Amino acid sequence: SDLTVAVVLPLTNTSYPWSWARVGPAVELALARVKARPDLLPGWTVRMVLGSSENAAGVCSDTAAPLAAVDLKWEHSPAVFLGPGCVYSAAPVGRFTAHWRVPLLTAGAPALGIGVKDEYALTTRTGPSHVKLGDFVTALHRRLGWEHQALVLYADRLGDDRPCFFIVEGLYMRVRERLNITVNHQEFVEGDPDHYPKLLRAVRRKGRVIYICSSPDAFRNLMLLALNAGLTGEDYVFFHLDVFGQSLKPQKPWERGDGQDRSARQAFQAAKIITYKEPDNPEYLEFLKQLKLLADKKFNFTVEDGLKNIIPASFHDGLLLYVQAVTETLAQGGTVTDGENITQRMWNRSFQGVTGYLKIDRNGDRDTDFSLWDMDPETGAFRVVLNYNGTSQELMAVSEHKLYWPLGYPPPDVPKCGFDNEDPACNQD
Amino acid sequence: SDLTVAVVLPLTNTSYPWSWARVGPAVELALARVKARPDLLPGWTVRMVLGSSENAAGVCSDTAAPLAAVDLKWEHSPAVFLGPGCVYSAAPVGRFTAHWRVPLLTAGAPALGIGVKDEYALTTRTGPSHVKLGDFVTALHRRLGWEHQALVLYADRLGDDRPCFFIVEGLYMRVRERLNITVNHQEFVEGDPDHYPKLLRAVRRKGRVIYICSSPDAFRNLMLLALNAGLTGEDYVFFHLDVFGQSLKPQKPWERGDGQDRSARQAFQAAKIITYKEPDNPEYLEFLKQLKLLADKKFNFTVEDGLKNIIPASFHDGLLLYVQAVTETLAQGGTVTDGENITQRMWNRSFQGVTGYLKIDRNGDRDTDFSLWDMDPETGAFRVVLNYNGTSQELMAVSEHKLYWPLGYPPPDVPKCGFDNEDPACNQD
Ligand SMILES: *[C@@H]1O[C@H](CO)[C@@H](O[C@@H]2O[C@H](CO)[C@@H](O)[C@H](O)[C@H]2NC(C)=O)[C@H](O)[C@H]1NC(C)=O
Ligand SMILES: *[C@@H]1O[C@H](CO)[C@@H](O[C@@H]2O[C@H](CO)[C@@H](O)[C@H](O)[C@H]2NC(C)=O)[C@H](O)[C@H]1NC(C)=O
Ligand SMILES: *[C@@H]1O[C@H](CO)[C@@H](O[C@@H]2O[C@H](CO)[C@@H](O)[C@H](O)[C@H]2NC(C)=O)[C@H](O)[C@H]1NC(C)=O
Ligand SMILES: *[C@@H]1O[C@H](CO)[C@@H](O[C@@H]2O[C@H](CO)[C@@H](O)[C@H](O)[C@H]2NC(C)=O)[C@H](O)[C@H]1NC(C)=O
Ligand SMILES: *[C@@H]1O[C@H](CO)[C@@H](O)[C@H](O)[C@H]1NC(C)=O
Ligand SMILES: *[C@@H]1O[C@H](CO)[C@@H](O)[C@H](O)[C@H]1NC(C)=O
Ligand SMILES: [Cl-]
Ligand SMILES: [Cl-]
């Protein structure tokens, strides 16, 4: 019998981490593995039906995706949906699959709202989610003694899936929930020179521990401006929330060869970069090789190296986790459409996949690991100094390296005389 | 053969102008008329299948409505959808019906966005729409010589269909488009005493011709505060955007018997009320009688008098207009599922219904008539002095009455020395 998987992803646009040009070969690799395991899905064959989350303009849409999901549902009666990856596309589709009582698996849709499973019943996220970034920051603040305040600056592109907004929204709610610190925040538009005076003023007025979600160039410009304004590593720390490591390729993220590298290097003495952790089990490197090969040969697409590859790898691992859950359900006398039973076997469970160890929490979302990159004083090069395990919630040093603090130890998150020092008797020096 | 009409409306909640307790009897009345007209729908019988736009909490929802529409579509293959009425419910349903190429008729969903028919293809609105309010204001400003500025203040209830927001959004875009005046605007929360200082300051600083969308009590309080601050009818005019005439029951909207009626009457010398026009053809009064009777006997609901009744009357008239369009389509050899052909016969067309004359514009939206209520100097009572025909776009005086201006003529929309008079030489007096 056929186990039909309904896919709703960007079938023609290849620019997303979850675009079919990347996810398609990853899924094919997972299915080829299933076919070679007679113990898996005894008596069933996995079949795929494809639908696109894209509108006429070629971008993931909050309307095209649900229209596609309904069409697939009606025509093929799928047992499970794979995707969408975009937050705006997955929100409406997930409400339909919940209503239909059909599981939905995705390594995308990291937004806070998708985490409300009373609404998104049967939605299992096998990739990163933004509230998990909040868990990492919570751990960082506790380890460094920051219990009072932080500022978050962020920018996105006019009409996209608003990645930075959702990153900050998840970080904000979770950090506020666990640390109860004041979290000031504000958006800006990267190409608007009018916003720089406001940002620099907000940095001085509202925070000492600062998080910035922006392009690599916007972060570098802000650091150069901070250095020129005399905001150094003794009093400030700037964390670039660069989950996919776009500013990384030794790593010298401050280098451009534009006549400002000496200043940029100096300015980065006060910066650290937060990224998803690069899987480092040997099975991942082999998957990457097979992924690139198949993507090139059967999907006409060149898959470049980078952290974005954890997404298709997570669709691969998630589909295998689902397969295991269904195999166990059949074994116990249930069937492939027992949505609740199958989902219950995926949540609050560990699994070994190409991305290594992976744990799905009790709310149906995968625990996410992060890496903190810091500067090597001697060379100015950046390297990972701390890794965060999202399951144990422990921060572990890497290679005996210690965190770099320009003049000693971490700056306090509140200035000696407060942010709005109005006490003539308090000497800020 | 059966012509199936899929309904997606509030089936259990009776508080909406488009709730089934009101719309259901209105539709029944229209169907009984069709059954008595053998010339209509030769060989077809209209059948109704019902779905609710309500979520578990009993309010119209942006999710329950489309889930219901899909369920109805699948199970009954309807030829046309009736409803939703709520803006948040109709937006997603309309995108589905457009995709399915099935007509959607509604006397609700007045929001600006629903007017983009490239998206909401086949959606025909037979009731009021908010951009039409913009047409009325345009006409008013031209007649009174207001070519520069206006201020709009508005408030809604925490999680409703945000009626005032959509009213102002439609007014703003259309007025800006046709007059190119500056339109300042701002929201407030009615029960928050903290907002009154800000509102009164914005009135002084930003406008002389002011529009307010709020509850009857919030408008009265604002008028009493304006009078106390010395803002009179010589320099200010306050238009209460009360489309359904909630502040009306002679009409003395300023009366409460709370010890402030003398002041309230005086304060209202500077106020006028904008409402939808009450249909005044004899067929409307008879429809109202039949509606109340049937609603009480078959739907267990007491239909009170009021302008909200134009909504069920417009679902009644719209369904008959649709019937006429389909009858003509059949006559020409087409069939009940020729969505485009049927819709084309409804747009840019006049029709006679219980609400009297009704014209559907070229964009598929009904032209809306409005009434302006003004104070009678002698009694302080309010009465209609001007009526606006949305098709001809002409303003016509009623009963030889003229507009009331406390001290002569309309106040100018810009103060003599400008809003921020900084010219020491200009005497505001
Ligand atoms: C594929 O997706 C990308 C990203 O969404 C599209 O690029 C954007 O296109 C929109 C138009 O809808 C522009 O307003 C943005 O400036 C573009 N942003 C980025 C980051 O590229 C792209 O056009 C889509 N289509 C194709 C064929 O690639
Ligand atoms: C992250 O931390 C968790 C600790 O809970 C590690 O999970 C354990 O992994 C071992 C070996 O895979 C299992 O035998 C245990 O059952 C796991 N414990 C739990 C509670 O699930 C996990 O290995 C760590 N991740 C990495 C990359 O080291
Ligand atoms: C029917 O609809 C009304 C209006 O939407 C509901 O009343 C609101 O209920 C919400 C809860 O979802 C409250 O937050 C609001 O304060 C209420 N506003 C108003 C104007 O009533 C009502 O509860 C719904 N259900 C029923 C049975 O009437
Ligand atoms: C609103 O104005 C329009 C003027 O265009 C009136 O419409 C005319 O109505 C008469 C009688 O019903 C028809 O013979 C004409 O064909 C209509 N003209 C057009 C252009 O459609 C309409 O009657 C007015 N409304 C009211 C209540 O008087
Ligand atoms: C959270 O901390 C702030 C001060 O940092 C305090 O005012 C507030 O009361 C705390 N939260 C709660 C729920 O008390
Ligand atoms: C609209 O009017 C304003 C001043 O009232 C003017 O500055 C503006 O240029 C006008 N619109 C356009 C498109 O020129
Ligand atoms: Cl997607
Ligand atoms: Cl509705």
Side-chain angles (χ1 to χ4, degrees):
Chain A
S1 302
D2 288 329
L3 190 169
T4 298
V5 179
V7 177
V8 179
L9 287 173
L11 301 188
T12 55
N13 192 308
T14 65
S15 71
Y16 300 94
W18 49 82
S19 285
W20 191 239
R22 290 191 193 57
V23 178
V27 164
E28 202 164 291
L29 289 170
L31 293 180
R33 173 178 310 196
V34 168
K35 187 187 172 180
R37 286 284 301 292
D39 55 303
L40 292 175
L41 303 178
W44 295 79
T45 306
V46 178
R47 292 310 180 196
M48 315 275 287
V49 286
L50 314 179
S52 186
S53 58
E54 296 169 39
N55 54 28
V59 311
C60 61
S61 153
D62 67 346
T63 291
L67 296 186
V70 175
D71 286 343
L72 290 177
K73 209 296 170 172
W74 287 341
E75 183 178 2
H76 307 286
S77 307
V80 57
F81 277 79
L82 190 59
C86 281
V87 169
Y88 285 127
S89 290
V93 178
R95 294 303 303 274
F96 271 102
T97 60
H99 177 68
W100 301 329
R101 291 155 57 74
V102 167
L104 179 158
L105 318 178
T106 183
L112 170 68
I114 305 297
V116 179
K117 304 299 174 75
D118 286 337
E119 272 169 29
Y120 295 92
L122 307 188
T123 281
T124 300
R125 287 187 289 186
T126 62
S129 55
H130 298 327
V131 292
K132 301 291 180 177
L133 169 55
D135 288 345
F136 174 60
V137 172
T138 296
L140 253 190
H141 282 235
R142 283 165 169 176
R143 174 201 196 72
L144 298 173
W146 295 326
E147 331 179 311
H148 296 102
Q149 188 159 321
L151 166 69
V152 188
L153 306 176
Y154 65 99
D156 283 308
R157 284 197 163 169
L158 297 57
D160 55 7
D161 203 42
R162 302 176 73 204
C164 277
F165 168 86
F166 289 118
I167 283 166
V168 175
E169 173 188 58
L171 183 162
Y172 176 90
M173 290 311 266
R174 180 56 56 82
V175 163
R176 289 250 51 182
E177 183 186 80
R178 306 184 68 182
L179 302 180
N180 192 30
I181 48 175
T182 294
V183 181
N184 288 311
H185 52 283
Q186 71 175 60
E187 182 173 28
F188 65 102
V189 174
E190 301 203 2
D192 194 341
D194 289 350
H195 285 182
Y196 295 70
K198 305 202 177 179
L199 290 168
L200 275 292
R201 181 176 69 175
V203 164
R204 283 183 51 72
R205 293 179 176 182
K206 310 283 187 187
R208 288 303 179 272
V209 175
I210 304 168
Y211 295 86
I212 302 179
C213 186
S214 74
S215 69
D217 286 358
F219 184 77
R220 179 173 188 271
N221 284 340
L222 288 178
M223 295 304 99
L224 285 167
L225 284 175
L227 177 69
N228 183 256
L231 315 178
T232 73
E234 314 172 53
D235 306 296
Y236 296 78
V237 61
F238 303 96
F239 289 100
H240 185 189
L241 292 171
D242 185 17
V243 298
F244 286 118
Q246 306 273 191
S247 63
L248 300 168
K249 291 150 61 188
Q251 297 291 338
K252 293 188 292 178
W254 46 261
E255 180 179 71
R256 290 291 188 287
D258 66 345
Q260 317 181 91
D261 293 333
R262 221 188 67 271
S263 294
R265 177 181 169 168
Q266 167 172 45
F268 273 57
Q269 284 180 19
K272 303 195 185 314
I273 303 160
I274 293 169
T275 70
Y276 286 136
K277 181 199 172 196
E278 179 82 38
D280 71 335
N281 50 287
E283 297 88 348
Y284 190 66
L285 293 178
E286 205 51 46
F287 169 80
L288 289 178
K289 293 174 185 181
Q290 292 182 291
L291 183 67
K292 299 178 181 168
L293 218 69
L294 189 57
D296 173 270
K297 283 188 167 300
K298 196 166 176 178
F299 298 77
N300 189 43
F301 181 72
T302 301
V303 171
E304 302 300 332
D305 287 300
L307 283 170
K308 287 185 182 188
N309 287 322
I310 61 181
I311 301 309
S314 297
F315 267 101
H316 170 290
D317 284 352
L319 178 54
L320 290 179
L321 165 63
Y322 167 75
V323 165
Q324 199 66 69
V326 175
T327 296
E328 300 164 344
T329 296
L330 293 167
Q332 299 222 63
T335 192
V336 309
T337 53
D338 297 340
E340 293 67 27
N341 274 294
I342 295 166
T343 296
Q344 195 163 177
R345 291 187 169 74
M346 295 190 283
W347 293 16
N348 180 43
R349 168 160 158 181
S350 47
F351 188 68
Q352 206 57 46
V354 302
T355 59
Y357 170 98
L358 87 81
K359 168 75 182 290
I360 299 296
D361 69 21
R362 293 187 155 103
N363 188 57
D365 306 319
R366 179 188 190 158
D367 287 338
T368 307
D369 292 357
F370 293 84
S371 289
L372 174 69
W373 301 69
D374 205 340
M375 171 185 279
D376 173 348
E378 318 199 59
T379 63
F382 273 65
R383 68 262 192 274
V384 179
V385 293
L386 265 190
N387 279 307
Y388 173 72
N389 177 313
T391 299
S392 67
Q393 301 205 197
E394 312 195 314
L395 283 172
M396 290 136 296
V398 186
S399 310
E400 250 69 55
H401 284 136
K402 298 176 183 302
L403 267 54
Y404 173 66
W405 297 118
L407 289 183
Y409 45 85
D413 66 341
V414 183
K416 180 183 175 295
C417 298
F419 283 94
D420 315 303
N421 181 36
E422 245 137 45
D423 186 343
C426 192
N427 176 22
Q428 298 154 64
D429 289 342
Chain B
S1 302
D2 288 329
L3 190 169
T4 298
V5 179
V7 177
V8 179
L9 287 173
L11 301 188
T12 55
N13 192 308
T14 65
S15 71
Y16 300 94
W18 49 82
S19 285
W20 191 239
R22 290 191 193 57
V23 178
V27 164
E28 202 164 291
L29 289 170
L31 293 180
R33 173 178 310 196
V34 168
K35 187 187 172 180
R37 286 284 301 292
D39 55 303
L40 292 175
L41 303 178
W44 295 79
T45 306
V46 178
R47 292 310 180 196
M48 315 275 287
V49 286
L50 314 179
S52 186
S53 58
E54 296 169 39
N55 54 28
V59 311
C60 61
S61 153
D62 67 346
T63 291
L67 296 186
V70 175
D71 286 343
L72 290 177
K73 209 296 170 172
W74 287 341
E75 183 178 2
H76 307 286
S77 307
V80 57
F81 277 79
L82 190 59
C86 281
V87 169
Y88 285 127
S89 290
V93 178
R95 294 303 303 274
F96 271 102
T97 60
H99 177 68
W100 301 329
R101 291 155 57 74
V102 167
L104 179 158
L105 318 178
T106 183
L112 170 68
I114 305 297
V116 179
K117 304 299 174 75
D118 286 337
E119 272 169 29
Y120 295 92
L122 307 188
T123 281
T124 300
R125 287 187 289 186
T126 62
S129 55
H130 298 327
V131 292
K132 301 291 180 177
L133 169 55
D135 288 345
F136 174 60
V137 172
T138 296
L140 253 190
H141 282 235
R142 283 165 169 176
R143 174 201 196 72
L144 298 173
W146 295 326
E147 331 179 311
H148 296 102
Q149 188 159 321
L151 166 69
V152 188
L153 306 176
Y154 65 99
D156 283 308
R157 284 197 163 169
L158 297 57
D160 55 7
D161 203 42
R162 302 176 73 204
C164 277
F165 168 86
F166 289 118
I167 283 166
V168 175
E169 173 188 58
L171 183 162
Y172 176 90
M173 290 311 266
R174 180 56 56 82
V175 163
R176 289 250 51 182
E177 183 186 80
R178 306 184 68 182
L179 302 180
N180 192 30
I181 48 175
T182 294
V183 181
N184 288 311
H185 52 283
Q186 71 175 60
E187 182 173 28
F188 65 102
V189 174
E190 301 203 2
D192 194 341
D194 289 350
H195 285 182
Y196 295 70
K198 305 202 177 179
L199 290 168
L200 275 292
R201 181 176 69 175
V203 164
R204 283 183 51 72
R205 293 179 176 182
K206 310 283 187 187
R208 288 303 179 272
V209 175
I210 304 168
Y211 295 86
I212 302 179
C213 186
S214 74
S215 69
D217 286 358
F219 184 77
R220 179 173 188 271
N221 284 340
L222 288 178
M223 295 304 99
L224 285 167
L225 284 175
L227 177 69
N228 183 256
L231 315 178
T232 73
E234 314 172 53
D235 306 296
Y236 296 78
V237 61
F238 303 96
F239 289 100
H240 185 189
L241 292 171
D242 185 17
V243 298
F244 286 118
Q246 306 273 191
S247 63
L248 300 168
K249 291 150 61 188
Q251 297 291 338
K252 293 188 292 178
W254 46 261
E255 180 179 71
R256 290 291 188 287
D258 66 345
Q260 317 181 91
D261 293 333
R262 221 188 67 271
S263 294
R265 177 181 169 168
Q266 167 172 45
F268 273 57
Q269 284 180 19
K272 303 195 185 314
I273 303 160
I274 293 169
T275 70
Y276 286 136
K277 181 199 172 196
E278 179 82 38
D280 71 335
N281 50 287
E283 297 88 348
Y284 190 66
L285 293 178
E286 205 51 46
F287 169 80
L288 289 178
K289 293 174 185 181
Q290 292 182 291
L291 183 67
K292 299 178 181 168
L293 218 69
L294 189 57
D296 173 270
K297 283 188 167 300
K298 196 166 176 178
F299 298 77
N300 189 43
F301 181 72
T302 301
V303 171
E304 302 300 332
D305 287 300
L307 283 170
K308 287 185 182 188
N309 287 322
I310 61 181
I311 301 309
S314 297
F315 267 101
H316 170 290
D317 284 352
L319 178 54
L320 290 179
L321 165 63
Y322 167 75
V323 165
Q324 199 66 69
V326 175
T327 296
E328 300 164 344
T329 296
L330 293 167
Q332 299 222 63
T335 192
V336 309
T337 53
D338 297 340
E340 293 67 27
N341 274 294
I342 295 166
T343 296
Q344 195 163 177
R345 291 187 169 74
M346 295 190 283
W347 293 16
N348 180 43
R349 168 160 158 181
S350 47
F351 188 68
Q352 206 57 46
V354 302
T355 59
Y357 170 98
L358 87 81
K359 168 75 182 290
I360 299 296
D361 69 21
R362 293 187 155 103
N363 188 57
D365 306 319
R366 179 188 190 158
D367 287 338
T368 307
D369 292 357
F370 293 84
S371 289
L372 174 69
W373 301 69
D374 205 340
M375 171 185 279
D376 173 348
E378 318 199 59
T379 63
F382 273 65
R383 68 262 192 274
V384 179
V385 293
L386 265 190
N387 279 307
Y388 173 72
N389 177 313
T391 299
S392 67
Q393 301 205 197
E394 312 195 314
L395 283 172
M396 290 136 296
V398 186
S399 310
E400 250 69 55
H401 284 136
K402 298 176 183 302
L403 267 54
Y404 173 66
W405 297 118
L407 289 183
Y409 45 85
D413 66 341
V414 183
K416 180 183 175 295
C417 298
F419 283 94
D420 315 303
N421 181 36
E422 245 137 45
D423 186 343
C426 192
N427 176 22
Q428 298 154 64
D429 289 342

